[PDB]
Design a protein around this ligand. Structure first.
Ligand code: HEM
Length: 94
């Protein structure tokens, strides 16, 4: 999974189902849906932080390098650039 489709926080918080198990690991949007059962450890752990900050876990365990790699193929997007260093503005329409 190799692209950066800049997604909005709402979007990430709208993929927490089962076939879109996303999460935010270091201001980045990952997708481990096809990795849920393909993850050496569990799957439900990726759901406990689905569309949410699993970074606490990722670091608590202090993951191996081979895992740091699948991260690169699990990114599907990044936190919007209007929402990386602000997260505080209106929208306005017409
Ligand atoms: C980029 C996303 C992730 C990738 C690519 C990934 C990949 C891996 C790999 C390759 C291992 C090593 C297997 C072993 O030690 O036998 C591992 C272990 C593990 N992972 Fe992940 N992982 C990811 C995210 C997560 C997250 C967010 C959680 C928790 C919510 C988690 C919890 C664990 C646990 C519990 C283990 C077993 C070893 C231990 O921590 O004692 N992983 N992971």
């Amino acid at each position: 999974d190799k692209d950066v489709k800049y997604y909005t926080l709402e979007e990430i918080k709208k993929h927490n189902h089962s076939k879109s198990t996303w999460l935010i690991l270091h201001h980045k949007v990952y997708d481990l849906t096809k990795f849920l059962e393909e993850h050496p450890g569990g799957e439900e752990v990726l759901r406990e932080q689905a569309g949410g900050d699993a970074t606490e876990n990722f670091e608590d365990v202090g993951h191996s390098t081979d895992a740091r790699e699948l991260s690169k193929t699990f990114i599907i997007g990044e936190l919007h650039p209007d929402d990386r260093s602000k997260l505080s503005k209106p929208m306005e329409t017409l």
